[PDB]
Amino acid sequence: PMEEEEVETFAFQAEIAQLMSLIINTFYSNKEIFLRELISNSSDALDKIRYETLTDPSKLDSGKELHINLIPNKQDRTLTIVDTGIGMTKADLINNLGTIAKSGTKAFMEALQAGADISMIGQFGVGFYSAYLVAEKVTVITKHNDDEQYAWESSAGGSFTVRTDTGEPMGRGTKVILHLKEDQTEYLEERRIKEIVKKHSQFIGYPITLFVE
Numbered sequence: 001p002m003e004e005e006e007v008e009t010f011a012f013q014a015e016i017a018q019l020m021s022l023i024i025n026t027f028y029s030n031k032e033i034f035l036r037e038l039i040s041n042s043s044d045a046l047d048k049i050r051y052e053t054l055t056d057p058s059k060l061d062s063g064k065e066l067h068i069n070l071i072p073n074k075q076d077r078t079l080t081i082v083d084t085g086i087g088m089t090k091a092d093l094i095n096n097l098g099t100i101a102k103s104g105t106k107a108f109m110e111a112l113q114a115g116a117d118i119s120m121i122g123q124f125g126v127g128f129y130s131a132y133l134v135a136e137k138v139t140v141i142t143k144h145n146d147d148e149q150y151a152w153e154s155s156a157g158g159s160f161t162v163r164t165d166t167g168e169p170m171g172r173g174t175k176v177i178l179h180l181k182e183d184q185t186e187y188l189e190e191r192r193i194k195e196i197v198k199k200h201s202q203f204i205g206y207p208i209t210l211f212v213e
């Protein structure tokens, strides 16, 4: 059929879109931490579910294994971070990713502009947007038990969409695909992903597997 997919277009919150341009349009040392961030949130995702999982273990009927996967892909020049923790509803996706104001955005913008490390990004409540330190597009496919599947996407530009996704079905958990920039192909090497995850994220208590090609 003429499949009728739903796509809702949105506007990043005024000061969130400032920030995104302050990341994409400014050289930063220590850019290798977009990963530690996107992995810390999966950890938090996987934590919530596990906590939910010890009163209702029907919450693992679509799911079961709490883990993380990194999937470097040299065909697409994409790096993908998949978990199978709690995931996000539409409100969750809309609110957490762009539409409503975050409390730390301003606090942080002043930090970087007076010489703070970009590693404080996680500290200031706005870790995700460090995806764009390295990523030119960024797609966050998610699924939650109460709700259905959804594909977030944004190339900045003040925009992000939230399409009700039909695509690879993924039980439960988020999937952050990154279309890396043409000088950010080092984060697609098997050696370098092992190197950063080692140095920056051995405090994660969920099996991190590398899908090496």
Ligand SMILES: CC(C)(C)c1cc(C(=O)N2Cc3ccccc3C2)ccc1O
Residues within 6 Å of the ligand: 037, 038, 039, 041, 042, 044, 045, 048, 083, 085, 086, 087, 088, 096, 097, 128, 140, 173, 174, 176
């Ligand atoms: C793209 C962001 C938001 C950054 C992200 C989110 C998740 C995820 O599934 N959640 C939902 C949830 C619920 C309670 C506590 C924490 C979280 C995070 C996973 C990965 C991921 O990158």
